A paper describes a structure:
To understand why this single amino acid substitution had such a drastic effect on recognition by many TCRs, we solved and compared the structures of [name] and YLQLRTFLL bound to HLA A∗02:01 at 1.67 Å and 2.0 Å, respectively. The HLA A∗02:01-[name] structure showed the Spike arginine at position 273 (peptide position 5) forms an obvious, protruding, positively charged focal point for TCRs that is stabilized by six intrapeptide bonds including three hydrogen bonds. Comparison of the atomic structures of HLA A∗02:01-[name] and HLA A∗02:01-YLQLRTFLL showed a largely preserved fold, but with local geometry alterations at the epitope residues 3 to 5 (Spike residues 271–273) which presumably form the majority of contacts with TCRs. Comparison between [name] peptide presentation in the unbound and bound structures showed the Spike arginine at position 273 undergoes a conformational shift during YLQ36 binding.
Residue numbers in the entry:
A (entry chain C): 1 to 9
B (entry chain B): 0 to 99
C (entry chain A): 1 to 276
Write the structure that this text describes.
């Protein structure tokens, strides 16, 4: 089950 | 990029017995970047029905793939895996040794 | 003991034409269960183990939406890092990401991971405490400042200690017939004459699961590494693994040598000896 939030480098 | 050369193993899924259907495997690992060309050869000629695993990588970020085909070993037929990658000045051929 | 869920993401820029190549794979332990490939026809998260196919359409719609959003995140990241590293648009570059969770022998949370590489080197990694980052260089330091200010570690802790463990446990129960089955190595030894004076003994471990194994040679009950050779663990293609170790020995002295096999599927380690 993939993580649902957005994290950008 | 940091580049790493592929490791290569050529082997059958099951013990090779002449006339008994089997799988020929070419396992490439330890390489970076991911773009790679892999053929399985029969008597020096490219085999058409070859599939491969989905790209994954190890803890050190290096890539691995399995290339494979169904085959039936015979006494006379020779098999090999032919690999090219940006790290190789020419394609690397590794012969199937049935004892390895 | 231990089980793990891990996702592996590779995004490769294509300066010649078009969008990055993006490939995502999910594993439980050493079993791949899902894939996405930006170049495949489906544009869907796809099953790669039968037991995941019992998830219903809401599951596949949600994993497809997330994996497509992941692909866009890593496309952006390629551009961001090209900028941070002052690189031209002429070359192909690679962003890799892995994240997931382990559960221990007690079936509770053991470990979380969320870490990246750029062109095959460490970029940034969540430390074991899930509180702080390891930034390999001043580019990753830039990400680290951003991520500290936005409390990214705290947000990931909730997924890693929570959702990740709950879904791993759900998979392990619905794939239980295979995921909680250990396949002990099928072992034998072969003998090959090198000269009139010496021979190779080869210790085989075949069709085992999971991949973790140890093969060791002893001579007269002491570890021997001199005059030994092995191969890295390799997939059989059917979900199991193979390995061998060999020792060169004086002809007639084969009986001095023992091959020791350690694997989760063996209640006690096996000892093999050329007696047959
Ligand atoms: Ca080349």
């Amino acid at each position: 089950y993939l993580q649902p939030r957005t994290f950008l480098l | 990029m940091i580049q790493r050369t592929p490791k290569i193993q050529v082997y059958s899924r099951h013990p090779a017995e002449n006339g008994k259907s089997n799988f020929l495997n070419c396992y490439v690992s330890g390489f970076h970047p991911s773009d790679i060309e892999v053929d399985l050869l029969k008597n020096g000629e490219r085999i058409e029905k070859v599939e491969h695993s989905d790209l994954s990588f190890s803890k050190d970020w290096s890539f691995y793939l399995l290339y494979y085909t169904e085959f039936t070993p015979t006494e006379k037929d020779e098999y090999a895996c032919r690999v090219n990658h940006v790290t190789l000045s020419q394609p690397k051929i590794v012969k199937w040794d049935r004892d390895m | 003991g231990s089980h793990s869920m891990r996702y592996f993401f590779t995004s490769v820029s294509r300066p010649g034409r078009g969008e990055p190549r993006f490939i995502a794979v999910g594993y439980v332990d050493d079993t791949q269960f899902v894939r996405f490939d930006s170049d495949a026809a489906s544009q869907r998260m796809e099953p790669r183990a039968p037991w995941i196919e019992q998830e219903g359409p809401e599951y596949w719609d949600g994993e497809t939406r997330k994996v497509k959003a992941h692909s866009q995140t890593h496309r952006v990241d390629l551009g961001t890092l090209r900028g941070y590293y002052n690189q031209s648009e002429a070359g192909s570059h690679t962003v890799q990401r892995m994240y997931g969770c382990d559960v221990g022998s007690d079936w509770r949370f053991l470990r979380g991971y969320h870490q990246y590489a750029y062109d095959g080197k460490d970029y940034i990694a969540l430390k074991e405490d899930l509180r702080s980052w390891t930034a390999a260089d001043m580019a990753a330091q830039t990400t680290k400042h951003k991520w500290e200010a936005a409390h990214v570690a705290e947000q990931l802790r909730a997924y890693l200690e929570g959702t990740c463990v709950e879904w791993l446990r759900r998979y392990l129960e619905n794939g239980k017939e295979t995921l909680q089955r250990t396949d002990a190595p099928k072992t034998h030894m072969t003998h090959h004459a090198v000269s009139d004076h010496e021979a190779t003994l080869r210790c085989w471990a075949l069709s085992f699961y999971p991949a973790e194994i140890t093969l060791t040679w002893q001579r007269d009950g002491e570890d021997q590494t001199q005059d030994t050779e092995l191969v890295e663990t390799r997939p059989a293609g059917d979900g199991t693994f193979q390995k061998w170790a060999a020792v060169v020995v004086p002809s007639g002295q084969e009986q001095r040598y023992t091959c020791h096999v350690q694997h989760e599927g063996l209640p006690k380690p096996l000892t093999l000896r050329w007696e047959p």
